[PDB]
Design a protein around this ligand. Structure first.
Ligand SMILES: *C(=O)[C@@H](NC(=O)/C(=N\OC(C)(C)C(=O)O)c1csc(N)n1)[C@H](C=C)NC(=O)NS(=O)(=O)n1nc(C2=NC=C(O)C(=O)C2)n(CCCS(C)(=O)=O)c1=O
Length: 500
């Protein structure tokens, strides 16, 4: 006989989307356990118990003998009460049923990267489950018990400490947008025979992550084999060169310098520019004079480079740093990357140019979307949030409102002007953005933008990794994904059409 104190497990808090839709739920599962010390007195029952558990009689008997010094072993976890009652109906001494809490993920693969999962012990192991584990877990209680020599509970004397349930967590994710984004990203991977991809949607006014999806994905309810590539929340833990999608930030520095206006002209002939042993190269090389809007429409590396030499790389680096490229988001998601915005005491000419067109810098899809959100929100960056925001924190003015407004107009022209990225056009709305194509033979296709251009509400980033068909440019591959997902997201959010 022994007086002992045992734990009372706590109920893990519910994770919902922003509207209360369930994303991670603690559900009762029937667990069968046994005390090997008690089992030793009832050997004649073992074979029938083994048969009920679908185990070979000899392996089962060997298992009980190997664990003979233990007072607890799991027999089977995750049964239905009906299934557990069938094993309990054998009335084997030392066999017990228990209702345990186990996570179920109702949206499965659709929000797997964001939500993450719990381990077999119900502890946060990945994603939000890990990041907010303290909030979700609660505090176990304590029970006083009298145990016999075998460790069998003879009497339940009293509860010394009641368990405290974990707390509900409402994510910033809008499950309706998440499903839309998930489906369209999946479809684009098929259309392009691509290896992987990410799609992030952000509320430019609140800093909320409305959707965050990646391909490949996995079913968190059935993690049996268990692919590492499929479990990566690429939008947060993968870094990439943003390329031509950072040209609006180089343009912001240009307009803020006092030396450039959108109608100023740059001569980009013959579509290449030698700087020692390095050559800056444009894709289409049949231009001479281009205005600043033209440089973005035509995505001229030569044009943005000449502007960068004039204003200096320091001014460009400062805008990129202020909008958060290669900077800590403060989110603390497990494995989240900071990326890298290179710096120099004295910027050489080749490095000034490559910085201006997003070569040699590394960012995450969340960073790039946050930077476009700041630009869309008249230059004001609202802090990022993975949770529903009721009281919006104060933003920081990172680009002056006039400069941000001018760059927004230029980006609407990139989408709507003749010779522009027409595939990004959103039916019924004015949209703005910029595509990118990064050579990693192998390519990464990008589109970053926001809408409605007259009163921006949503920023979006589409990343398609290694499209394998003839088409690889961001304006061909990623821009139509932005169009479909932005049209859907605006309609779900009842955003009034502005292209009247
Ligand atoms: C910006 O992203 C910039 N990328 C680079 O300079 C990088 N590589 O360039 C390529 C050409 C892919 C290479 O070297 O193989 C790069 C940056 S960081 C890194 N590691 N590599 C390029 C080139 C200036 N810009 C774009 O790709 N912009 S875009 O996606 O908007 N886009 N440009 C074009 C074309 N325009 C004109 C032509 O003649 C073309 O052949 C391609 N397109 C095609 C569709 C245009 S449209 C009018 O139908 O929408 C884009 O989508």
């Amino acid at each position: 006989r022994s007086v002992r104190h045992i734990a009372i497990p706590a109920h893990r808090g519910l994770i919902t989307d922003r509207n209360g839709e369930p994303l991670a739920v603690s559900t009762p599962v029937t667990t069968l356990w046994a005390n090997p010390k008690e089992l030793m007195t009832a050997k004649e029952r073992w074979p029938q118990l083994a048969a009920a558990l679908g185990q070979d009689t000899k392996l089962f008997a060997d298992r009980i003998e190997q664990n003979a010094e233990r007072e607890f072993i799991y027999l089977v976890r995750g049964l239905t009460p009906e299934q557990g009652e069938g094993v309990i109906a054998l009335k084997v001494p030392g066999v017990y049923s228990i209702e345990e809490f186990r996570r179920f993920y109702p949206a499965g693969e659709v929000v797997a990267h964001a939500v993450g999962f719990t381990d077999v012990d119900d502890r946060g192991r990945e994603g939000i489950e890990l990041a907010f584990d303290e909030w979700l877990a609660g505090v176990p209680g304590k029970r006083q018990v009298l145990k016999d020599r075998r460790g069998r509970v003879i009497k339940d004397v009293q509860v010394t400490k009641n368990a405290k349930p974990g707390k509900t967590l409402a994510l910033s994710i809008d499950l309706r947008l998440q499903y839309l984004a998930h489906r369209e990203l999946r479809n684009a991977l098929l259309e392009n025979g691509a290896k992987a991809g990410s799609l992030v949607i952000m509320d430019v006014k609140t800093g909320e992550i409305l959707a965050m999806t990646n391909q490949p994905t996995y079913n968190p309810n059935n993690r049996r084999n268990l692919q590492p590539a499929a479990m990566r929340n690429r939008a947060m833990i993968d870094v990439f060169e943003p390329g031509s999608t950072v040209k609006p930030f180089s343009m912001s520095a240009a307009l803020a310098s006092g030396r450039w206006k959108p109608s100023d002209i740059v001569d980009v002939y013959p579509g290449t520019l030698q700087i020692g042993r390095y050559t800056i190269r444009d894709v289409s090389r049949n231009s001479r004079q281009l205005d600043l809007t033209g440089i973005l429409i035509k995505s001229s590396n030569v044009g943005i480079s000449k502007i960068a030499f004039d204003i200096g790389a320091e001014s460009i680096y400062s805008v990129m740093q202020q909008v958060g490229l290669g900077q800590d988001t403060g989110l603390g998601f497990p494995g989240e990357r900071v990326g890298n915005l290179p710096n120099h005491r004295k910027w050489p000419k080749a490095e000034t140019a490559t910085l201006a067109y997003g070569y040699g810098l590394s960012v995450t899809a969340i960073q790039l979307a946050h930077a476009y959100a700041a630009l869309a929100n008249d230059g004001k960056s609202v802090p990022l949030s993975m949770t529903r925001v009721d009281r919006v924190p104060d933003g920081v003015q990172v680009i002056s409102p006039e400069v941000a407004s001018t760059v927004q107009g230029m980006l609407q022209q990139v989408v709507e002007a003749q010779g522009g990225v027409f595939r990004a056009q959103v039916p019924g709305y004015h949209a703005a953005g910029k595509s990118g194509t990064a050579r990693k033979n192998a390519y990464r296709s990008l589109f970053a933008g926001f809408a409605p251009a007259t009163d921006p509400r949503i920023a979006m980033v589409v990343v398609i990794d290694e499209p394998s068909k003839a088409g690889y440019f961001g304006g061909l591959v990623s821009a139509p994904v932005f169009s479909k997902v932005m049209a859907g997201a605006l309609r779900l959010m009842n955003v009034p059409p502005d292209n009247l």
